[PDB]
Design a protein around this ligand. Structure first.
Ligand SMILES: C[C@]12CC[C@@H]3c4ccc(O)cc4/C(=N/OCC(=O)O)C[C@H]3[C@@H]1CC[C@@H]2O
Lengths: 208, 214
């Protein structure tokens, strides 16, 4: 096989122009390697950008350009967008199969919306009680959730996810407070508290 | 208006063999190529095989020439990729794309189907409180607790409710996953209209539709 290489990652800014190279371990990349660049977004969302070394596909912002620059095949992004943040995979033809690059990952402030949900009747019946706190619409993707019961902070029984980039180019996450039907009724209120970029947001619900 | 939709997650024992499928809509099934790529746990895409539907010309590579067969059903616009004698090695996400020629190819793809080489979930409806019903938009939810392994497929109203849907990342706690999915609708829409979340756990042949009531 002919290993294809790319740049691990690239931090860019809006408006700018970035160039991604694609170097082949077999030697000089030519028009016969029918270089193809593919854009990959969260959740295995692949999209065609350039094929046949330099042909833009239908629905591709002209800011995207493919061309052979030296022994390499490169992708040029003239006019960065926040949405243009993704993983760029180039693929070179090697007679009878495409060989892909491990991918170049390019990088390019919203308060989170908190949503609490009380235990499900059905779940309570099982003497269990799961408090759900679904956090959304935030960027940068970096928050700190804390739970409070009767204004007092609780450490045990709390499970919080990892931020996940959403199609709207914003992060989301979820936190769980595992309690017993007992504990759930034994208190006056539960507060899901999120701290993001300097300020705090908190919601509460009362077993009452 | 082009879309290639693939089948669902697949859990298989070693030595067995799965049957994946990519169906096309929006173009000449027969005058277009169909390739399959796969992505192992973090190992870049690997080329597998390709097939030309309207001329049953399937081309493989050394690597997959043995465990990979590929058929087309020109009468349903579906392409079956079958893998034989499964190994942990094969655990990956198989996707599918189309192509006209070496100059124009791999523009559109499928969401890809995950293959893994078990305990079903408990689904609980989540009715909105004062911190979910918020004036014009009310948001219902579904707690998909203690299932294994990943993934679960959560849908709302059999897919009719496509916008405002938010499935959050699962969390692991004692070899058991638990996730939550929410959907937002106009406060007039519910309880008025029915809202049901359809959870599916391929790994355990389990499917649960839970009506979310007030
Ligand atoms: C990459 C591709 C799928 C794989 C096809 C293949 C696969 C194996 C091989 O040995 C040769 C070829 C080609 N050899 O000759 C061409 C033919 O005779 O038409 C055409 C390629 C196709 C071009 C469009 C599609 O995306």
């Amino acid at each position: 096989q002919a290993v294809v290489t790319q740049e691990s990652a690239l931090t860019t800014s809006p408006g700018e122009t970035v160039t991604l190279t694609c170097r082949s371990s077999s030697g000089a990349i030519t028009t016969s390697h029918y270089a193809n660049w593919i854009q990959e977004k969260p959740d295995h969302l692949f999209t065609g950008l350039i094929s046949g070394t330099n042909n833009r596909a239908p629905g591709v912002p002209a800011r995207f350009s493919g061309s052979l620059i030296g022994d390499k095949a490169a992708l040029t992004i003239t006019g960065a967008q926040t949405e243009d943040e993704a993983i760029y995979i180039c693929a070179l033809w090697f007679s009878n199969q495409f060989i892909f690059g491990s991918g170049t990952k390019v990088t390019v402030k919203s308060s989170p919306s908190v949503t609490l949900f009380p235990p499900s009747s059905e779940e309570l019946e099982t003497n269990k009680a799961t408090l759900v706190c679904t956090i959304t619409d935030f960027y940068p993707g970096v928050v700190t959730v804390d739970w409070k019961v009767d204004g007092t902070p609780v450490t045990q029984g709390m499970e919080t996810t990892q931020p996940s980039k959403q199609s709207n180019n914003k992060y989301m996450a979820s936190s769980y407070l595992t309690l017993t039907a007992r504990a759930w009724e034994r208190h006056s209120s539960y507060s899901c508290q999120v701290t993001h970029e300097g300020h705090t947001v908190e919601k509460s619900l009362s077993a009452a | 208006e082009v879309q290639l939709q693939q089948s669902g997650a697949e859990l298989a024992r070693p030595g067995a063999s799965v049957k994946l499928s990519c169906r096309t809509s929006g173009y000449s099934f027969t005058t277009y190529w169909m390739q399959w790529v796969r992505q192992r746990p973090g190992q870049g895409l690997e080329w597998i095989a390709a097939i030309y539907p309207g001329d049953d010309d399937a081309r493989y590579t050394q690597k997959f020439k043995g465990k990979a067969t590929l058929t087309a059903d020109r009468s349903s616009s579906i392409v079956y990729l079958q893998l034989n004698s499964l190994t942990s090695e094969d655990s990956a996400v198989y996707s599918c794309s189309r192509g006209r020629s070496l100059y124009y190819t791999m523009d559109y793809w499928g969401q890809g189907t995950s293959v893994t080489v078990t305990t079903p979930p408990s689904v609980y409806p989540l009715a909105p409180g004062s911190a979910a019903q918020t004036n014009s938009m009310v948001t219902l939810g579904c707690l998909v607790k203690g299932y294994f392994p990943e993934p679960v497929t959560v849908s709302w109203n059999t897919g009719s409710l496509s916008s405002g849907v938010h499935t959050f990342p699962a969390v692991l706690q004692s070899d058991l996953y638990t996730l939550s999915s929410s959907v937002t609708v106009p406060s007039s829409t519910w309880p008025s209209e029915t809202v049901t979340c359809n959870v599916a756990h391929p790994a355990s042949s389990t499917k649960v539709d839970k009506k979310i009531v007030p």
